[PDB]
Design a protein around this ligand. Sequence first.
Ligand code: PMR
Ligand code: PMR
Ligand code: SF4
Ligand code: SF4
Lengths: 414, 415, 418, 418
Amino acid sequence: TFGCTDSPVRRERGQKAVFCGLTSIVWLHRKMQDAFFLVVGSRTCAHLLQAAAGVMIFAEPRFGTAVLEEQDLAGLADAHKELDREVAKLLERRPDIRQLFLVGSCPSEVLKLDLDRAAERLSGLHAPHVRVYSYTGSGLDTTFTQGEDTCLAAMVPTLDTTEAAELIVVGALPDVVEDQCLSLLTQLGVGPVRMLPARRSDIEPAVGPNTRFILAQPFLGETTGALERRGAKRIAAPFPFGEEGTTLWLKAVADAYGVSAEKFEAVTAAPRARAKKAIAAHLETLTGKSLFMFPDSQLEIPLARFLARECGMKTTEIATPFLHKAIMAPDLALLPSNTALTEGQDLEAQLDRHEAINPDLTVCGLGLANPLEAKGHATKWAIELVFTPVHFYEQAGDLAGLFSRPLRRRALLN
Amino acid sequence: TFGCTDSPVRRERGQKAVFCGLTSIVWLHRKMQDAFFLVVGSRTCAHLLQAAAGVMIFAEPRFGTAVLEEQDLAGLADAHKELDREVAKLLERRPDIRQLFLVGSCPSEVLKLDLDRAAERLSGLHAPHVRVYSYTGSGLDTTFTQGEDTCLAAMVPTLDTTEAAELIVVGALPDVVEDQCLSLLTQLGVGPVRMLPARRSDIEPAVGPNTRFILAQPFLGETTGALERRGAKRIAAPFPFGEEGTTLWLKAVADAYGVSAEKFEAVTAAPRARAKKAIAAHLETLTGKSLFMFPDSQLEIPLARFLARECGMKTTEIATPFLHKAIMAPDLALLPSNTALTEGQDLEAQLDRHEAINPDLTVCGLGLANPLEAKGHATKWAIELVFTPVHFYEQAGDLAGLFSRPLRRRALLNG
Amino acid sequence: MKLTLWTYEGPPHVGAMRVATAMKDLQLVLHGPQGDTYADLLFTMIERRNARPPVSFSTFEASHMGTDTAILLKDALAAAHARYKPQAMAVALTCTAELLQDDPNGISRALNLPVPVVPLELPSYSRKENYGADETFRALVRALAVPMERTPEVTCNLLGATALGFRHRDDVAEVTKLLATMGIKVNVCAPLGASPDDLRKLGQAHFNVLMYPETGESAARHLERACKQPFTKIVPIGVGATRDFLAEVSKITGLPVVTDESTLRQPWWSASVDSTYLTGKRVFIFGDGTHVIAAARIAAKEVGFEVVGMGCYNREMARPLRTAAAEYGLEALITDDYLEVEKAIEAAAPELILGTQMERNIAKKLGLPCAVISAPVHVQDFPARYAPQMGFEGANVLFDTWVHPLVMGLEEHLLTMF
Amino acid sequence: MKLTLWTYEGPPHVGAMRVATAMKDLQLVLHGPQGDTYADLLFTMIERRNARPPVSFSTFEASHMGTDTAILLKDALAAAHARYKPQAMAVALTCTAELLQDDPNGISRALNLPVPVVPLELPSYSRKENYGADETFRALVRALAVPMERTPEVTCNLLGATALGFRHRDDVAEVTKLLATMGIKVNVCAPLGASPDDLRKLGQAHFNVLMYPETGESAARHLERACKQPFTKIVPIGVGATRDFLAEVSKITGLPVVTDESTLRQPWWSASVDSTYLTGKRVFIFGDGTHVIAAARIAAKEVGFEVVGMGCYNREMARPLRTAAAEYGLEALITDDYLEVEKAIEAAAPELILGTQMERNIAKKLGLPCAVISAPVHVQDFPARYAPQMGFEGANVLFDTWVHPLVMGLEEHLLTMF
Ligand code: PMR
Ligand code: PMR
Ligand code: SF4
Ligand code: SF4
């Protein structure tokens, strides 16, 4: 009745309608104050970033694209020299940049520009004031949120060493969410706890053989691997979405740090009740409604789990761009047994399945949202789940509200 | 060729298209910082003030209307204890007001509300923090700028007495204009000098048998009379419009205070050449152009004089709501002798004369402007002349520009 | 006495002026002091009309009071007629002339002009602008309108459009289109565009479209008695209300409702995911009764706002507003006092204000988004461009207008988690 | 490498999508990576479309590169034809696919589909969006348009209107009205609303109306050679340019110019006394060549502004702009670099900016009034309401639009002396 542990997931390739990992810069540059994100790509990549950024593009943001010119398209050694000239020119103008990320794209990768080596040589040149990294955000390699994962993983080898037994919470979270997380954990008697990424380059967490980490976000497979390579040990947990997800997440940390059951219960009791109450306000519209999720971000399984178990929704097909088995285990074990799971996408085939199901609410991207609405399908646009505070207790009702809203609007307008 | 001293002026009456003196509150309240202007009138009077004030009405202005209700019209209705209630309530929440003006309107006057009596009663009740005055701004009594005159005149009997021989410059001028005037007179060695009205209620000028005053605005006949009753003597002068107007006005003060010719010419030479050069930028468009002025404000004669003498314009009919002969004598002596002068108005007859003249530029109100534009007549809307710094040397170019602008727009838009 | 800074409506004689100025070949003569011509500027400047309003004042002042005031009125009536040769005239008192004892009816009858002079009774101390317009138009229709045989084809009159009416120009154009698509032509649009002789031919229409109850209600009721003409009770502002209006017209005439919806874009704009952030946004609504009632329905049922306040300044529309407000679980705010509107807005803490030019400024003061839905209005809300509030294009216009002041989805999401 | 934050135009394949999405019954297949479908959102979100664009991508990714990429393009063409049964298809390369060795022409010929598959040459590292659309439409006209008999009635084609075009929807409607008044009907409007079959019958039109040079100039020049059809050189934005356009059309057809100006209000609005304070307002103008040339004439000759800067981001319009700018005594600013636009604005210190969405944001930082006259543009500039830039209603819309951000005459006089 509950448990998708052994559910056969449909793995699917074909036409896809997803974002590349470049899009991660849009939220990363806001969290990471000392950082600049320089894409090496074409006008296409620049055009994506500006359309994605919206009003952000006019807010003097800490990102840009070194757009490939015709002369850059042949002769690898010359292209590397041009990149260095372009970086030297940017850095010379911008003393405030302490972290520079060289971001890989489809054009740079087909050109086989070794940005990993460029980062290595640029770090050596511009040390100690500017550390430069390299990671891929290309559509060939990443989908949407995986851009955060490749970014954070690039920082890990370079983090300071320590023998301290500290906690690292991994994932870029809204400041309010991050603050609540630190508070709850401090109340539980666990510390010091640091965040990856930090808000500044001079306060990144150190890592060593006694470090524990826990993922706040499901899409962090590479970063997990890199942390494990440094000796860090992961705390397995469902993702902190809703009252139940948050409790189970904090409980895993508590159990790992030997926190008493009485202490856990006393710190967690009030915020738990407040979360369940906030959610209850959205139960009437949400309960019994069929849910369908197109793949976008890897938040699908944890959010499907939250919506079924806490909001009474019925799952139909729940699709994800990538499913990390070990990381997704705790959530899969709670996901209702009926759920049809998909990894990847064959767009037209998936759209045919969608129409046959005729789901009450469809989570999908902005390329699908309006066309689906026009066909009489109520939608919930997927990007909002990455651009709203949605983790932990205080945001549990707001999260439910994100899904009740489009159904309430539909009813309101007819 | 110049001089309209003995020109017959047409005294015309009938339908008029002019503002009542209530409209003067719109600029008066900005100048007089600790004053409040309370019209006793109808919704018509509040409607006018709101329309006139535009953006100002939303800036919590220092004016209002005690609007008469049906109950206030009755022969047993104590509208005076109603009015006292109204001002007590107004002053209760407004300790910033040191001067309250009870402004008469057509309804208050036809009803025969004694606002003068009310002002004395109420200033006794609210002494020494607020002095309350009474004047008429009604359409029955006053036209447009004459409301400034009736306001200032009401303040005069109340001014401190002095034996001092000081100068009062009369007329509410923009701050920048007032500072320039004050600077030039200080440079000439004349002083000390004060403005009526002052910026605040505690620095109003004193008046006495040795006081001199000069008018900066032509519409100040009643204030002139009131000051002369306190024993003060006027300095006659053309109005300080343009380079020539301003020199003559300054020279009159210079001559009055025994200022030498050497010092006058030295203080005055640089500002003068600067003004004359600023005017020349507008000469090509303005020269030879015929001018017609409808009556609105009493600035018509002095502005017509400036446009003919300094801008090469040709007068046709120049009309004014009121022509104070003594005050306007200097400007009239300088007006081109061909000028047809009119005091008052019969709107349809005056529009008929306008039509037959077919003048190049017509100064008129906002009620006539667009209608006249639609008949092919280039207009210069008259209100702007009270709502722009136009007096003295520094603004002489800007003043010429007010008149060249509509002619240049017409050319720019018709090829 | 009432301490007054802002007034939503002028005196009733201004309403008379906007019936006269709406019409052609009619001269209105107001018994009034010199100075009251300030109202002409409303028409020449705000509506930017290219001609002087067909209105003149007797222009009494201090030197011609007493027995002269009655003579000045006589002369004004005589001179207006000789010069302009109108098909009919109207005579009325200004607020100051109401305190006098001159009789415009007796004065006008003794003059014995070859055309009708219609005397108007406008109580200036108890009534306001909208009543002035409604009563002037009614008095003129009762003087001129006459029973006639119906037009061979189905026709209606349009009633209530005036000079200085908020979007009256384009509402007339848009409503005419709505009716033409159903095979219904307009007989007379009145007062706007109509002459006294057009008012004489009002009775040959099959029914009346009551465009604006505040300026057409009384004439609509008279024409129902005199000419046995039904008039529409639904004002076609909003998609729903436009549909109900057409169903109403259909019942009156027996003609099927036909629509051209090829450029109706508001429903899809509102249904698109771009608009989901608009759900439950708290809106305060103020203005005249007609426009407030219409706006609340669009807000709640078409755009998906939560209506959190509803009121009007004209208590002539208080009954239907109270009835409308109750549908939203709200008590109607009936007041002409802007300070009381300001208090109600602050108490309701809305995210959007729909109202008058006064509410535009209250909204500025409070740092709140605002759109104009109703007179009183400034020059900008008399646009050069096609800008109806009525019908299907009006729904398009209203959608764009209301969402404009609101920061957009993306911006909202950046101003919370960053 | 060229450091880029803001880009005025996207890549050429987005221009191809603008043509394909404008059309009906045409499937575009783009050889491109997973992720490039972001451009779909331009049409679904900004232009607010109710269907998926008729554009599919081969969707190659790291695990399926090499000899698979060619297979993927083949499968994408086959699948798009089998599912949608279009009348024709187009195939092009994304920027990334340009770096690959796959031959779209060779692959499509080896599939041997029942319909034409038109290969497109879009150089993504040297050219941009507008060229992509201009070229795509040209290639389609080259493939489909044939010599024909002329229609018995005088008809024309409208050329250059696309999806994601700034006021293309309403410009099309307004230009159509202008032509109908002269007795000229539209044969085919293309690309917007046209099917591949409509393009086959382009030849029967007497002449072509080039609505937008940046997106239709090449197809206009081809049709002059192939179908002997003259095309109009004057773009009807502004009263004067509309009159010049109508006289131009008059020479082509021999038909006299007939105008309906019953609703043309901009000239009177501009002539009215309310507008006198607009004289000499210093205006800086930026955007695409067409809209900047048109705006400068209105600014100077119709509104009375002084034009203090003129520029465009699209080098295809550099010469016509230089020519136009010299008439104002100006050097045209030719740049795609918003930082250069910002500097030129700062040096000119204008009182008003007419530009794109970027200029609106430059103006905000500088605290300057700004109105939008050209793409790139946000969702608000794709309105529900009627909002042409062309013809007589366009002139109305443009007058209201440009004057709105400016502080009014009265408020100006309050600066100032108080
Ligand atoms: C790259 C294409 C693209 C386009 C054309 C839009 C339009 C648009 N995106 Mg945006 N958006 C694009 C992409 C993205 N958006 C993103 C974010 C975003 C948010 C959070 C939101 C949004 C929105 C929009 C909107 C609505 C208007 C606006 O709020 O600016 C457009 C036209 C807006 C909305 O109402 O969605 C339903 C909203 O809340 N976008 C992100 C996050 C990385 C991306 C990549
Ligand atoms: C009493 C009626 C009335 C009306 C309806 C308007 C409208 C109007 N007055 Mg105003 N104006 C009125 C009167 C007055 N105006 C006054 C002032 C004034 C100025 C300085 C200006 C102005 C103007 C206007 C305008 C134009 C729009 C605006 O500036 O707000 C309207 C509609 C405006 C203009 O462009 O005039 C050509 C301008 O610069 N008014 C004054 C000074 C006491 C009065 C009495
Ligand atoms: S003319 Fe008389 S009634 Fe009219 S606004 Fe002026 S004071 Fe009031
Ligand atoms: S990285 Fe690849 S998928 Fe993303 S915008 Fe650039 S070319 Fe497109």
